[PDB]
Design a protein around this nucleic acid. Structure first.
Ligand SMILES: c1ccc2c(c1)cc1ccc3cccc4ccc2c1c34
Lengths: 289, 323
DNA sequence: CATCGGGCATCGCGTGACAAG
DNA sequence: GCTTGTCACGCGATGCCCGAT
C-alpha cells in the first residue's frame, strides 16, 4: 500500500489504543477508591486515597507476607564461626512447631540431627556466596527434613543499630548465613562397601524403588530389607566377598518410597584392584520382580 | 488560552499529583510516562486493598533492640535468601506483583513489569504450560518455565507456589479470583588447567599440586585418607580405568583415558588423564598421572565415541566418599 | 413543575513535533 | 536513518449548569 498512509493509520491506531488504556486505568481507579463521576473527579479522589495510604512498593511486612504465602518457610540468621543463632523469625513456630525461645541463644548445630552436624560445618566455613542444602531439624525427639537456602552476608548489617549494652555487641562475628528453611518393571545398579552402605546409586532407582539417590547414598541396604530376609541379604553380602569375581543372586523385599514391599533380585559381585587384587567395592544390579 | 488546553492542563496536573505520590525513588518517577503512572497507581491501590484484608514481631521473651532492627528488615532478608524473585499473577495473567530482584535475574525493572501481562515475559513454547498451572483440585504448584533474560536470551526457572484467592479487587460484584503466589528460582578456566597427581601402585593418591586442589576440592591430606583412587571414579568408568591400569602395569604407560572424578562437592568432573609408571632400581615405585579437565560436552562426546564397549558404560548416578 | 437555548467543560479523534533506541 | 512511542495541540460532538421562559 501507500507507505505514508499506512504509517499514518498505524500511528492513529497507536494513539487510540493509548487513549483506551488510559480510560481503562481511570475506570480501575474509580473501582479502587472508597466512593466512586467524570475523569477529573476520579483522579482527585485517587490522589486523596493514595495520600491517605502513603522507598519500596510494598512494606516489609507485606513483602514477607507475599513470600510466606507463596512458599512457607522461616528465616534464620546464624554466625558462620560458631553457628550461633543471631535471629529467627516467628514463622519457625508454624514450620518446626518450635517457639522462638528454642532457637535464640542457641547454635544451628544444636538444632539439627547429629548425623548432619559435620555437613553443616561444610556449608558454613569461609553468582554471590549462595548456600543451599538439606538437613534434619528438631520439633522423644522428632525430626523433619528441612531444605535450607540462603547466602553469606557480612556482619553487622548496615542500617541496623547496635547499642552498647546489647547481646550482639560482644560477639563480633564477621560473616553470617542468612537463610530460609522449608519443610519438604525396571532395574538400577549400585556400589556398596563390604558392609552394605550405598556409595554409588544409579539414577534409575527412582523408577525402581521411588527413592532419590540422596535418600539411598550413605544408608545401608539392609535397612530397606524385610527382617525375615535381612539375614539372607547379609549372608549374600558376606559370601560375595569370599568369592571374588563370582556373581551372587539373591531375592528379598525392599521397602519402597511408599512404604510398600517390592520383590528385588540383586546380582552382586566384587571389583578387584588390578594391581593388589584387593576388594574396592561391591557392584549390585537390583532388578524388579 | 482555550478550554481544551485548560482541561488537558487540569488532567496533567492531577496526573503529576498521582505520580509524585507513587512509592518509587524520584529518579524512577521522573522517567515515567502518564500511562505507566496510572498503571502503577492502580497497582499500588489493588495491592493495598488486598493487604488490607489478608495482612494483620519478635516474641517478647527474646526482644532486644538489635533483634527488633533485624525484624524490621525480615522481609528484605527473606527476599535476599530467596535466590530468585517473587511473582503474584492473577487469573487474567496480569502481574499483580514482582519483587525488585527480578532485575537481578531477568533485567526487567520492577516498575515496568507490574500490572502487565505475564506472557510478555514467558517464552512462547512454555506459555501454555503456565496457563494450565493458573487453572482433583488441590492448591500447591511446582513447575518449570523459561523467562526472557536481558542479561543473557532466556533463563529456565523453577516456580514453586500456590493458588490462593486474591481478595479485594472489586471486580464486576464478582467473588475473588485465584491468583498464583510463586517464587521463581534458577536451575542447577579449562584452557590449559593441567594438574598432576602422584599415586601408589594401587592408585592411592599421595600427592597433588595446587591446580589439582582447585579442580577436585580436596586438601592434599583429604585426598589420601579415602583409600585408593577407584573410590573417586564414576561407576560408568571403573572398568575402563581398570583396563588402562592393567595396560600401564604391562607397558609402563596407560595412554590417554577420559573418565569422571568425584569432587569434594560430590560432583563429577570429566578428566583426560595419562598415568606413567616411575621406577626405582628397575622396579615399579609410584604413578604420576597428568590430568586436564574437560567440559561436559567434550566428555560425553568422548564417551559416545568410545572404542571399548564395557558394562555400565552408559550409566549415570551419584556417589559419596568416606575415609 | 418542567423545557429551552448560553457558554464553558469533558471527551474522543487524528496529526505533527520530537526523541529513545 | 528508520521505528515505536510520548506528548501537545486543534477540533468538533456532547455534557453539565442555569437563567429565562
Ligand atoms: C585421583 C584419584 C584417582 C585417579 C586419579 C586422580 C587420576 C587417574 C589417572 C589415570 C588413571 C588410569 C587408570 C586408573 C585410574 C584410577 C584412579 C585414578 C586415575 C586412574
Amino acid at each position: 500500500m501507500d507507505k505514508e498512509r499506512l504509517a499514518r493509520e498505524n500511528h492513529s491506531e497507536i494513539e487510540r489504543r493509548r487513549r483506551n488504556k488510559m480510560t481503562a486505568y481511570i475506570t480501575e481507579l474509580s473501582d479502587m477508591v472508597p466512593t466512586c463521576p467524570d475523569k477529573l473527579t476520579i483522579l482527585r479522589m485517587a490522589v486523596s486515597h493514595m495520600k491517605s495510604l502513603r522507598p519500596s512498593f510494598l512494606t516489609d511486612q507485606e513483602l514477607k507476607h507475599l513470600i510466606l504465602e507463596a512458599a512457607d518457610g522461616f528465616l534464620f540468621i546464624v554466625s558462620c564461626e560458631t553457628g550461633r543463632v543471631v535471629y529467627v523469625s516467628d514463622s519457625v513456630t508454624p514450620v518446626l512447631n518450635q517457639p522462638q525461645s528454642e532457637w535464640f541463644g542457641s547454635t544451628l548445630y544444636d538444632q539439627v540431627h547429629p548425623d548432619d552436624v559435620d555437613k553443616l560445618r561444610e556449608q558454613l566455613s569461609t553468582m554471590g556466596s549462595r548456600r543451599s542444602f538439606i538437613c534434619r531439624m528438631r520439633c522423644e525427639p522428632h525430626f523433619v527434613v528441612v531444605h535450607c537456602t540462603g547466602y553469606i552476608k557480612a556482619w553487622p548489617p548496615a542500617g541496623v543499630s547496635l547499642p552498647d549494652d546489647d547481646p550482639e555487641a560482644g560477639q563480633g562475628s564477621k560473616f553470617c548465613l542468612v537463610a530460609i528453611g522449608r519443610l519438604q518393571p525396571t532395574e538400577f545398579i549400585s556400589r556398596h562397601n563390604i558392609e552394605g552402605i550405598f556409595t554409588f546409586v544409579d539414577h534409575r532407582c527412582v523408577a525402581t524403588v521411588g527413592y532419590q539417590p540422596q535418600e539411598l547414598l550413605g544408608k545401608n541396604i539392609v535397612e530397606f530389607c524385610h527382617p525375615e530376609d535381612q539375614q539372607l541379604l547379609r549372608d549374600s553380602f558376606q559370601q560375595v566377598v569370599k568369592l571374588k569375581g563370582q556373581v551372587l543372586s539373591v531375592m528379598f523385599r525392599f521397602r519402597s518410597k511408599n512404604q510398600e514391599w517390592l520383590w528385588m533380585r540383586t546380582s552382586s559381585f566384587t571389583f578387584q584392584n588390578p594391581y593388589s587384587d584387593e576388594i574396592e567395592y561391591i557392584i549390585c544390579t537390583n532388578t524388579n520382580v | 488560552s482555550n478550554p481544551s488546553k485548560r482541561h488537558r492542563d487540569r488532567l496533567n496536573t492531577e496526573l503529576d499529583r498521582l505520580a509524585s505520590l507513587l512509592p518509587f525513588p524520584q529518579d524512577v518517577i521522573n522517567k515515567l510516562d502518564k500511562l505507566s503512572v496510572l498503571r502503577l497507581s492502580v497497582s499500588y491501590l489493588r495491592a493495598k486493598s488486598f493487604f488490607d484484608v489478608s495482612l494483620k514481631g519478635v516474641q517478647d521473651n527474646c526482644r532486644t533492640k538489635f533483634r527488633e532492627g533485624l525484624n524490621l528488615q525480615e522481609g528484605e532478608f527473606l527476599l535476599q535468601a530467596l535466590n530468585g524473585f517473587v511473582l503474584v499473577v492473577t487469573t487474567d495473567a496480569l502481574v499483580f506483583y514482582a519483587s525488585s530482584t527480578i532485575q537481578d535475574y531477568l533485567g526487567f525493572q520492577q516498575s515496568d513489569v507490574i500490572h502487565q501481562s505475564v506472557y510478555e515475559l514467558i517464552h512462547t513454547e512454555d506459555r501454555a504450560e503456565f496457563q494450565r498451572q493458573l487453572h482433583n483440585s488441590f492448591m500447591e504448584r511446582c513447575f518449570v518455565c523459561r523467562l526472557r533474560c536481558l542479561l543473557d536470551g532466556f533463563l529456565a526457572m523453577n516456580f514453586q507456589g500456590r493458588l490462593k484467592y486474591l481478595h479485594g479487587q472489586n471486580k464486576k460484584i464478582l467473588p475473588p479470583q485465584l491468583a498464583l503466589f510463586a517464587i521463581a528460582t534458577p536451575l542447577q578456566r579449562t584452557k590449559n588447567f593441567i594438574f598432576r597427581t602422584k599415586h601408589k601402585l594401587d592408585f592411592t593418591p599421595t600427592g597433588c599440586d595446587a591446580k589439582g586442589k582447585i579442580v577436585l576440592g580436596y586438601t592434599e591430606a583429604e585426598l589420601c585418607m579415602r583409600g585408593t583412587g577407584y573410590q573417586f571414579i564414576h561407576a560408568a568408568d571403573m572398568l575402563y580405568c581398570a583396563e588402562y591400569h592393567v595396560r600401564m602395569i604391562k607397558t609402563g604407560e596407560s595412554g590417554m583415558i577420559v573418565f569422571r572424578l568425584l569432587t569434594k562437592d560430590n560432583r563429577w568432573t570429566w578428566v583426560q588423564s595419562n598415568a606413567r609408571l616411575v621406577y626405582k632400581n628397575g622396579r615399579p615405585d609410584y604413578i604420576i598421572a597428568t590430568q586436564r579437565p574437560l567440559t561436559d560436552e567434550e566428555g560425553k562426546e568422548h564417551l559416545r565415541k568410545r572404542t571399548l564397549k564395557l558394562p555400565f558404560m552408559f550409566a549415570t548416578g551419584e556417589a559419596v566418599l568416606y575415609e
